[PDB]
């Protein structure tokens, strides 16, 4: 799954 | 509330330090105090919040899985009675995990979601709501399990609805939301075909929009598209 | 004392589970409750105690070093004033670290060391005493720094004295004690020549005794001898 | 440095 966008 | 005496800016500052020191419990407590100041969060602050609680609950989930695996082996054939201790400790970790999720869910309800008007913030927080209900789902067993699952579903769907209307299909929050909702379908909802359909449709729509992107944004989006690819290769 | 209602055997059992789940704070609290039952610890239990608190304080020390490094950069040339927050948070981690060391030191004084009559147990606990004073030394700055350092020195020396008299030079506790006392000399006492002399003498005396060893013991001892080798290659 | 002997 995926969670802190640049 | 023991962060109540700290400046908002100092909490954010210390959250960044805590991240650097890999002190994620600290980071989460700093960011919780920052949220409870009552102001909306900027993009960077929203990222701190989600990185913090992801790390905290991620250790809990890893531990729960180890202990749940041991406990299932204690239920098996030719397995010697070992007492109530494996169950007891798995329950202690479970309750701790459940409290972190409830804390995150509480911040989102009081009052991050309702004050989030822009699409990037509202989708971000509804994806969080889906994610933290999904973690509750992973450990739920009672009757309430269906209701937890529906609650996860419902947050993800509202977030999906907004993201489709308001964001490009390469948007990294939109991409990560789709990825996680697909994981929800595969791992929680016993809907692997939906999981695969969503991952593939999301991937293909992003691919067709990559040409619109600068070199840095292309990098951000293709990273998450690769994660969709990875799941599809796992699932098919 | 909140482990007081748990069976000693259940605490040990849950400590082993906590190790498997990489839940080392838990592991340390279980082992603290086990010690406070008042009975001597077996070999396996002594190992649980030291693995637990090593992991706990090891995260603290890593965080302290990150924050101390940031704080030193805030003191440097052309460095913009950032407020009291870096110092404050480094102090919070420091105080937490200091409390773990004080807790370990407290278990050893009350009353593990004084009831440890056999050489393997007494040396093990005096090495722990040296190690946890050495961690206090790493962060100490006041006048008391010299006294902390002496206290570390003194535990290590008593342990060295017993181990030389009572253990073979391949004994892994003797080897690990020498390794750590050498690190003490290099990193705390500003005595690199002593550190190197001790590592080399320890290594050479173990090498000459390896022929006495079964294949499994040879493996145990040469692992730590390699660590002596590594430091000597680092130090020379 | 070094601290759980087999
Ligand atoms: Mg203010
Ligand atoms: Mg439960
Ligand atoms: Mg009893
Ligand atoms: Mg201090």
Numbering used by the authors:
A (entry chain B), D (entry chain B): 1 to 6
B (entry chain A), C (entry chain A): -4 to 231
Which statements did the authors publish about this structure?
The hub protein 14-3-3 binds hundreds of different protein partners, typically in phosphorylated and structurally disordered regions of its client proteins. Hotspot analysis, by means of truncation and mutation studies, of 14-3-3 in complex with a binding peptide enabled critical interfacial residues to be prioritized in developing a non-natural peptide stabilizer of the 14-3-3/ChREBP protein complex. In addition to the phospho-binding pocket; (i) Asn226, (ii) Lys122 and (iii) the hydrophobic patch formed by Leu218, Ile219 and Leu222 were critical for protein complex formation.
In contrast, truncations of Thz (−1, 2d, dl-4-thiazolylalanine) elicited a 43-fold change in binding affinity. This fold change translates to an individual ΔΔG of 2.2 kcal mol−1, the greatest binding energy contribution of the N-terminal amino acids. The backbone carbonyl of Thz(−1) forms a hydrogen bond with the side chain of Asn226 of 14-3-3. Truncating peptide 1 at Thz(−1) (peptide 2c) resulted in a conformational change of Thz(−1), creating an additional hydrogen bond between the N-terminus of Thz(−1) and Asn226. We hypothesize that the alignment of the −1 amino acid backbone to Asn226 of 14-3-3 leads to the strong contribution of this −1 amino acid to 14-3-3 binding. The further truncation of the peptide results in a loss of both hydrogen bonds (peptide 2d, ESI Fig. S6†). In contrast, N-terminally truncated peptide 2d does engage this pocket with a phosphoserine and binds uniquely via an N-terminal motif in the 14-3-3 binding groove. A structural overlay of 14-3-3 bound to ChREBP and 14-3-3 bound to 2d clearly shows the complementary binding of the two peptides within the 14-3-3 binding groove. The phosphoserine of 2d occupies a composite pocket formed by the phospho-binding pocket of 14-3-3 and the α-helix of ChREBP. Cooperativity analysis of the complex elicited an α-factor of 36, indicating strong cooperative ternary complex formation. Utilizing the functional mapping results, we developed a minimum peptide sequence (2d) that was able to selectively stabilize the 14-3-3/ChREBP PPI with an attractive cooperativity factor (α) of 36.
